[PDB]
Amino acid sequence: QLLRELKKMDDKALLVEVQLLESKTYHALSNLPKARAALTSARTTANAIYCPPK
Amino acid sequence: MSEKKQPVDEDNWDDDNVEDDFSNQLRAELEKHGYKMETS
Amino acid sequence: PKNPDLRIAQLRFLLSLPEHRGDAAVRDELMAAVRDNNMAPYYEALCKSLDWQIDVDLLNKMKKANEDELKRLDEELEDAEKNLGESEIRDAMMAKAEYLCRIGDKEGALTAFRKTYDKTVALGHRLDIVFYLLRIGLFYMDNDLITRNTEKAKSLIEEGGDWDRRNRLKVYQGLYCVAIRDFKQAAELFLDTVSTFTSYELMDYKTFVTYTVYVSMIALERPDLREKVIKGAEILEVLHSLPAVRQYLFSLYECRYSVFFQSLAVVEQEMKKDWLFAPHYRYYVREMRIHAYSQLLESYRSLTLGYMAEAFGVGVEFIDQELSRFIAAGRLHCKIDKVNEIVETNRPDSKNWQYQETIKKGDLLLNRVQKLSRVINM
């Protein structure tokens, strides 16, 4: 329900603000390929803006 | 082909070896086996 | 369209063997008979179940609703030809006639499918009809219908890289083989664990994961076993929600012997009330027992059954006669012994049987060539 709302709006960082948490829970459930996918989305998201500080 | 004497005369079926082995041997397969460990 | 109906098939199996509840066949079977226009699911269960107190009238209203649907079909067959379009007769009755197949088992099927198969503008138009045979072929365990529709799917439905309903074919063949005597076909064709994601045979996707583990603990060698159900991280979640399944798995790789009978008891009691497992529930027991005993004999040559006894918990005379029956099966060669009592294993099949296999071919193989060299001169 988060992905249907964020990838059209303005905050590109608010996507990865929960997609990095999805990368946490797919490393937690050990979905290693989908963790790689979420990390790649995070790396291509962070190429625009500096982020909430840490 | 009348051979001069003989004219006078995998659904559930590969398992038959296991079943005829297991006719009067472990007829329940678990209901003693799950209860063996508290016998001794 | 088929999830509560495959659940009706689950109920067919669920009130096939046990009689511990003689009122599920009124509770969730009448709850099924009021939905889906399920007519035949009570019309054939009207004899094998109870007296059905007075179960005609609340079913008279629903067979009247079926009559309404059928009479607007019978008007629709000539109302759609007045619609100046292509095959609108075929469209307008194939819709509600696949729905007749949803209502009635074979009649709507036969009166529908031999008309709506007449033009095939897509392999979906074949394959939905094939699906509407596959539902009844799971309900009634046919062979002709639900292997010859798969032959038809293996006639022309190879084309089109649509992959969903081509993997459905793989899943149906896996279900059909594991529905009878499968070793390898369900493992090979349930390779596609993750990549299905939604079906009616996927009425519980996690039970499909139970299916693929309940065959991939048989058809799978130990390097392949760790590679699939350990080094499969994409399957690790849906085995991770299942404790005793994952327990039996990681113990069986861990060689945790005293919980094997516990976990096997869990899986066997699950095997009792799950369908397409009646040709399997006694075979599976000794199958997985001798499967664990494979590497248990690979363990040692110096081995006693007291070690086995405190490895299992009680096996002294139990496993004596049990492994005696496994030797009598021919597999699992070891010399179980009286008071000396040293379970001695052998060496693999090189010695002279590797020499012997060739002429064990060339006994009857060469009898073939002998007699078929005797074919020439009479």
Curated annotation (Swiss-Prot), chain A:
Tissue specificity: Highly expressed in embryonic stem cells (ESCs). Expression decreases as ESCs differentiate.
Modification comment: Phosphorylated by AMPK.
Subcellular location per the Swiss-Prot or TrEMBL entry: Nucleus; Cytoplasm, Cytosol
Stretch forming the signal peptide: none
Expression triggers: By FOXO4; expression in embryonic stem cells (ESCs) is mediated by FOXO4.
Function statement: Component of the 26S proteasome, a multiprotein complex involved in the ATP-dependent degradation of ubiquitinated proteins. This complex plays a key role in the maintenance of protein homeostasis by removing misfolded or damaged proteins, which could impair cellular functions, and by removing proteins whose functions are no longer required. Therefore, the proteasome participates in numerous cellular processes, including cell cycle progression, apoptosis, or DNA damage repair. In the complex, PSMD11 is required for proteasome assembly.
Summary of subunit composition and partner proteins: Component of the 19S proteasome regulatory particle complex. The 26S proteasome consists of a 20S core particle (CP) and two 19S regulatory subunits (RP). The regulatory particle is made of a lid composed of 9 subunits including PSMD11, a base containing 6 ATPases and few additional components.
Similarity remark: Belongs to the proteasome subunit S9 family.
This protein's name: 26S proteasome non-ATPase regulatory subunit 11
Originating species: Homo sapiens (Human)
Name of the encoding gene: PSMD11
Full protein: residues contained: 152 to 205 of 422
From Swiss-Prot, chain C:
Matches recorded under Pfam families: PCI (PF01399), RPN7 (PF10602), RPN7_PSMD6_C (PF21154)
Organism for this UniProt entry: Homo sapiens (Human)
Gene3D superfamilies: 1.25.40.570
SMART domains: PINT (SM00088)
Domain of life of the source: Eukaryota
Signal peptide: none
GO cellular component, one term: cytosol
Keyword vocabulary terms for this entry: Proteasome
Domain PCI: 182-350
Subunit structure as annotated in this protein's UniProt entry: Component of the 19S proteasome regulatory particle complex. The 26S proteasome consists of a 20S core particle (CP) and two 19S regulatory subunits (RP). The regulatory particle is made of a lid composed of 9 subunits including PSMD6, a base containing 6 ATPases and few additional components.
InterPro entries the record matches: PCI_dom, Rpn7/CSN1, Rpn7_N, RPN7_PSMD6_C, TPR-like_helical_dom_sf, WH_DNA-bd_sf
Described function: Component of the 26S proteasome, a multiprotein complex involved in the ATP-dependent degradation of ubiquitinated proteins. This complex plays a key role in the maintenance of protein homeostasis by removing misfolded or damaged proteins, which could impair cellular functions, and by removing proteins whose functions are no longer required. Therefore, the proteasome participates in numerous cellular processes, including cell cycle progression, apoptosis, or DNA damage repair.
Protein's recorded name: 26S proteasome non-ATPase regulatory subunit 6
GO biological process assignments: proteasome-mediated ubiquitin-dependent protein catabolic process
Sequence similarity: Belongs to the proteasome subunit S10 family.
